[PDB]
Amino acid sequence: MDLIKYFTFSMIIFILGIWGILLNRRNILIMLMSIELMLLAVNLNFLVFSVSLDDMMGQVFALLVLTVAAAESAIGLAIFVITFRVRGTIAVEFINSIQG
Amino acid sequence: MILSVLSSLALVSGLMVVRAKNPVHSVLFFILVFCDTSGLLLLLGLDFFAMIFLVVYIGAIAVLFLFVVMMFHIQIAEIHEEVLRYLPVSGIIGLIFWWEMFFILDNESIPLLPTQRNTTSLRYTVYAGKVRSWTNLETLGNLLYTYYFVWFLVSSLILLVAMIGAIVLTMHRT
Amino acid sequence: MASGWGITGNKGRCYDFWMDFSECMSHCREPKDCTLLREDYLECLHHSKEFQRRNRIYKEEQRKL
Amino acid sequence: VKVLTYFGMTLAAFAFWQSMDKVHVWIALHQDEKQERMEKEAEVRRVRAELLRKA
Amino acid sequence: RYLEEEDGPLMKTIKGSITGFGAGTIYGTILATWKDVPRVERNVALPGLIRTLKMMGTHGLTFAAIGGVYIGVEQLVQNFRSKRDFYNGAIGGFVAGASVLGYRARSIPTAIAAGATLAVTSALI
Amino acid sequence: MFNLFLAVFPEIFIINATFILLIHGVVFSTSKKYDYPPLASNVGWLGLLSVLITLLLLAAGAPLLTIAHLFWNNLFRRDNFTYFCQIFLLLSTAGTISMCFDFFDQERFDAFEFIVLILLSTCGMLFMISAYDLIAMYLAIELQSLCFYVIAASKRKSEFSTEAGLKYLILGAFSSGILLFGCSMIYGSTGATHFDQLAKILTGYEITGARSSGIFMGILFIAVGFLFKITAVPFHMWAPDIYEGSPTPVTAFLSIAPKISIFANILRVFIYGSYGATLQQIFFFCSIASMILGALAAMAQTKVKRLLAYSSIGHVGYICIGFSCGTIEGIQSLLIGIFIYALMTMDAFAIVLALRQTRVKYIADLGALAKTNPILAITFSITMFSYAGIPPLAGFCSKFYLFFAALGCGAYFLALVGVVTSVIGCFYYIRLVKRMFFDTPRTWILYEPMDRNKSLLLAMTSFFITLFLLYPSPLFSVTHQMALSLYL
Amino acid sequence: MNTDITALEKAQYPVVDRNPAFTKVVGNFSTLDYLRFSTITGISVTVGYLSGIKPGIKGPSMVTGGLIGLMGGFMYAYQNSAGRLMGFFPNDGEVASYQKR
Amino acid sequence: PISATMVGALLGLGTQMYSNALRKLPYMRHPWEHVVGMGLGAVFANQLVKWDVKLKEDLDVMLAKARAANERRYF
Amino acid sequence: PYGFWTFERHNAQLRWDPQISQVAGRRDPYDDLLE
């Protein structure tokens, strides 16, 4: 039952990311962290499957997804900083001008 | 059992990432979720990935999150909302995703039920593979830079874009 | 396990089954001709039928007890 | 939260994961009924399409 | 193409009402979650949950009424007249639409429009 | 050893040229001696030259791009389909760059890093087209996406541009995570990431009763990611806001090139892999939703950029109808629709960038343009009638297929949706022609004449739009070639 | 590192040399190859000069454009020469020199 | 008759005049550009005709192979 | 078409993998004992 238990560990992290999106409509920083939780869960999936199949391709991709996650976080927080610097606040009511 | 302890720690720590009032605490609970993930990786025998999750996720990414969040001094009013009203929608979404994905492997990967018989005596050992064993580190390093070097280089291009975009978006030179 | 690279530095556990299935599919113009080799590869991947059979044995033991 | 609150939530999560273990064993125990039901539904579809082509 | 069923007009109506209630509950949850909370309610949690559950129940009720009356009238048409077509059913869609959505909207032109739309939708099938 | 890299000569050249331009820009923009010169136009001209040399290298080396295919097999796959897709992508990038010099000079947008990021994303889309493994596909998609996140926020003091970048990063990272979860399910279930291995594993079975739910959901999540990328409803709401909020040359670039590259990916992944019906029903239902929602939302718009965004959503619906049918003519028509929509969009954004020198924002700003600039009002009316699909303009071609497949794959509800949404689209397109020709406003806006680059591009695209149906043989032949080369 | 030059589409002309060495391909450069090289380099120098006038850096811009053109023109000439030696492009002169030496 | 060269030259001349008109310039501003456009349009039209001929040959080969693969089914 | 998998473009692994069949990292473990 090993494979199912590791899988459900990763799955709970993924669902927690989804819920964190669902539960933070005023908190866009936590939304970015929920996306990072989903990415972590996917990385875990790849590593667990690599072990389970005796195949190395899951580990190569896990390392590359690590690089991608780091780049995404750096750019994401830069955009957060310039959004805050322009507006003076992070409240969602100040980032809703574009619509229709 | 051990997997149950780690799963419970990660579940509570993740709830605290997505439910803490203070975003600094959220970033700190995220560090705990990454530590727990490192423990899981150690159980799978992948010690390189277990160390790298510590070095990159906690040592570098969480630090950046912490620096930004701490200097932002977010006020609790700008981000506060009551979440009792989302229990039904969270319930339906989470229940659909639970019933469908916590059991996606069950048809394909049927668990072996533990019997009251010693099945350890049927483990077949092949000593030929054990003469010169490879670590996780050198097994990965055998592939990254030769058979799959193009993806390695594309990842470098991704990092270059991150450096350029960070400078261009935020730099105000004195 | 279709790449061949094993996680301990040897041929993957399920590579030979993959290669049998692939070589069969390279000349058989009907996929049904290589069904047995395909389910051999997938059985190697997940051990579904082996574990199902062992669970049958365990269930019968519990029933006769 | 209080430290005791984090401890109690961990205990509850541990109980949840043991319950999930019981669910997994239940699903594993009913693979044979799934297989036998699938035998019927696929064979019904065969006997069906074969009869529908007799005419 | 349709030879997998066991039918039963009363069973059909009951199951249709039950499915209507389920879909209406889901729809009411979605609509409640899309909306913001009134400003007097931002700092207290319970009234938001009450409003969400009320919306769930009301939408479940209206959708159950539609999903029940539609098939009920469909069978009560095809039972007495005992002819199977798309005509049998265009009447059920119309009566469901008119009755339920005109009781809800409190308007007769809206009842006629809703029945007409449901009639065309059930006609295409 | 050196001759193996003949297969990556175009990419090597474009990447090295991008590095040279990055260094040149950063060295001479910081120079006190030259008084910190704005280098956006200089590096723009040099980068346009680099793109044209890359195009020369790629098109003149057609057989050499398939050299060492076994050595390069685990990294990418170059064939005729990729050859033509990459040529078209490079042409789109060259046109978009040529449309930016007036914006650089007059708004004084001085950042040369804009050109560098455009070139790096062009590299990423070039790698996207030749991707032949889920890993490589994801990496190239992420490179392209990160470049777009950064250029969407380029006007870093503007509320709109910062808002656009923030929504793009969150919705883009969310969709990428969903797609990556699908790749993990497929890998876990099949032990394979290469497209050939996935083809062999999945053909002959589809849903054979004992269907792998892991494979099925990997496919579903990957499909959701692709649909986000092509702005199909219900994964579309990021597009109008990002299109409006981004700087207009970014909007022009995001409208064309990513669609070419993602549709190449979709073809080589789905049409080539083998899950079957569900995959096409996904795209069928999303095409219908896209057509309806795009038509209604565009009818509601009062600003030019939003109208164009919603029009693009509707047109991707029309294009995806071709992928839904799953035949040779379906793929051919998808490719023809992509090509014609790209040329039309390039026409439309050339006009928009020309009018952005006097800050066009609303449809009503185009009042009395047939008096102040009659030939521009005619060129723009031709584009709007082409968008509406009025024969014998090039836009009819794509509309013709929609109904051809609807009556070919036997789908009359699709036909009815097409008739109603075509009528709605015609209405909101001819509303602009009414504004430029029939209205008599009290206050007029006089617009500055466009530069030579945009006038030449506009003249060429307008001649194509009016006269393509007279000599359509090359596009038909080449798209038939690409559709065949997907399998052989 | 195991390698394999074999192409997906077979060479349609006499294969003078399957995997010609770098210096052999460079020495195979013809008059047309040098014409392509020179045209690309000259156009690139010119574009560098013309686009450099407004920022005031016409000379450095000329050097940058010339470097881009030199790399691109050399790559193009190499492409053509190696394709001729490998039989992918019409290689009359390569075959005439091969059948004699 | 109506050769590709003449259609291309006319199209190129029309392209230079259209460009001048879209920029509110006299139709014949910079006539040497009108000559250049005529030449480039002629070259482009002739090359398009040659490319179309080549495309047809390639398509015929591809269609031959597809039909052979399909006829293999009934063996 | 009838058996796209049958075409030579689709059998790249079957011809490349034998060329790397002796590479450290993917050998049968007994190969080192006899060689």
Swiss-Prot record, chain A:
PANTHER family, per database record? NADH DEHYDROGENASE SUBUNIT 4L-RELATED, NADH-UBIQUINONE OXIDOREDUCTASE SUBUNIT ND4L
Similarity field: Belongs to the complex I subunit 4L family.
Query: Under which EC number(s) is this enzyme classified?
Result: 7.1.1.2
Q: Which gene encodes it?
A: ND4L
Top-level taxon: Eukaryota
Q: How does it assemble?
A: Complex I is composed of at least 49 different subunits.
Protein name as it appears in the record: NADH-ubiquinone oxidoreductase chain 4L
Q: How does it sit in the membrane?
A: Multi-pass membrane protein
Q: Does the keyword Signal apply?
A: no
Q: Name one GO cellular component term.
A: mitochondrial membrane
| Extent of the signal sequence | none
- Top enzyme class: translocase
Catalytic function, reaction form:
a ubiquinone + NADH + 5 H(+)(in) = a ubiquinol + NAD(+) + 4 H(+)(out)
Q: Name one Pfam family in it.
A: Oxidored_q2
Q: Where in the cell is it found?
A: Mitochondrion membrane
Which Gene3D superfamilies is this protein grouped with?
Answer: 1.10.287.3510
UniProtKB/Swiss-Prot annotation, chain B:
> Membrane topology type, per the record?
Multi-pass membrane protein
Q: Where in the cell is it found?
A: Mitochondrion membrane
TM annotation in the entry? 48-68, 86-106, 150-170
Keyword match Nuclease: no
Its top-level enzyme class, in one word, is: translocase
Does the keyword section mention Electron transport? yes
User: Can you name a GO cellular component term?
Assistant: mitochondrial membrane
EC numbers for this chain: 7.1.1.2
Q: Where is the signal peptide?
A: none
- Keywords (A to Z) from UniProt: Electron transport, Membrane, Mitochondrion, NAD, Respiratory chain, Translocase, Transmembrane, Transmembrane helix, Transport, Ubiquinone
Q: Which reaction does it catalyse?
A: a ubiquinone + NADH + 5 H(+)(in) = a ubiquinol + NAD(+) + 4 H(+)(out)
The record's GO molecular-function terms, alphabetically, read: NADH dehydrogenase (ubiquinone) activity
Kindly report the protein's main subcellular placement as a broad class: mitochondrion
Assembly behavior:
Complex I is composed of at least 49 different subunits.
The record's function comment reads: Core subunit of the mitochondrial membrane respiratory chain NADH dehydrogenase (Complex I) that is believed to belong to the minimal assembly required for catalysis. Complex I functions in the transfer of electrons from NADH to the respiratory chain. The immediate electron acceptor for the enzyme is believed to be ubiquinone.
Miscellaneous comment as given in the Swiss-Prot or TrEMBL entry:
A stretch of 270 kb of the mitochondrial genome is duplicated within the centromere of chromosome 2 resulting in the duplication of the gene. The expression of the duplicated gene (At2g07731) is not demonstrated. It is also probably not RNA edited and therefore differs in all the positions known to be edited.
Q: Which protein family is named in the record?
A: Belongs to the complex I subunit 6 family.
Protein name per Swiss-Prot or TrEMBL: NADH-ubiquinone oxidoreductase chain 6
Query: What is the species of this protein?
Result: Arabidopsis thaliana (Mouse-ear cress)
Its gene name is ND6
Range of the intact protein held here: 1 to 174 of 205
Curated annotation (Swiss-Prot), chain C:
Q: Reproduce the free-text note on domains from the UniProt record.
A: Contains two C-X9-C motifs that are predicted to form a helix-coil-helix structure, permitting the formation of intramolecular disulfide bonds.
Kindly list the GO CC terms recorded for this protein: cytosol; mitochondrial inner membrane; mitochondrial intermembrane space; mitochondrion
Q: List the disulfide bonds.
A: 14-44, 24-34
Q: How does it sit in the membrane?
A: Peripheral membrane protein
**Motif mapping: Cx9C motif 1:** 14-24
Task: Domain (CHCH): give its ranges.
Answer: 11-52
**Which stretch of the full-length chain is present here?**
1 to 65 of 83
What highest taxon heads this organism's lineage? Eukaryota
Sequence motif: Cx9C motif 2, positions: 34-44
- Where found? Mitochondrion; Mitochondrion inner membrane; Mitochondrion intermembrane space
Subunit structure as annotated in this protein's UniProt entry? Complex I is composed of at least 49 different subunits. This is a component of the iron-sulfur (IP) fragment of the enzyme.
Q: What is this protein called?
A: NADH dehydrogenase [ubiquinone] iron-sulfur protein 5-B
Q: Does the keyword Electron transport apply?
A: yes
Swiss-Prot record, chain E:
The protein's predominant localisation is plastid
Chain positions covered by the region annotation Contains beta strands = 1-59
Give compartment(s).
Plastid, Chloroplast outer membrane; Mitochondrion outer membrane; Mitochondrion inner membrane
* GO CC annotation: chloroplast; chloroplast outer membrane; cytosol; mitochondrial outer membrane; mitochondrion; plastid outer membrane; pore complex; TIM22 mitochondrial import inner membrane insertion complex
Mark the transmembrane ranges.
18-34, 56-73, 86-103
A Gene Ontology BP annotation from the UniProt entry: protein insertion into mitochondrial inner membrane
Null allele phenotype: Lethal when homozygous.
Query: Which UniProt keywords are listed?
Result: Acetylation, Chloroplast, Ion transport, Membrane, Mitochondrion, Mitochondrion inner membrane, Mitochondrion outer membrane, Plastid, Plastid outer membrane, Porin, Transmembrane, Transmembrane beta strand, Transmembrane helix, Transport
What is the protein's membrane topology class?
A: Multi-pass membrane protein
Quaternary form? Homodimer and oligomers in membrane. Part of both the NADH-ubiquinone oxidoreductase complex I and of the TIM17:23 complex. Interacts with TIM23-2.
Q: What does this protein do?
A: Voltage-dependent high-conductance channel with a slight cation-selectivity; selective for amino acids but excludes triosephosphates or uncharged sugars. Non-essential amino acid-selective channel protein and translocation pore for NADPH:protochlorophyllide oxidoreductase A (PORA) and possibly PORB.
Protein name in the entry: Outer envelope pore protein 16-3, chloroplastic/mitochondrial
List the taxonomic lineage: Eukaryota, Viridiplantae, Streptophyta, Embryophyta, Tracheophyta
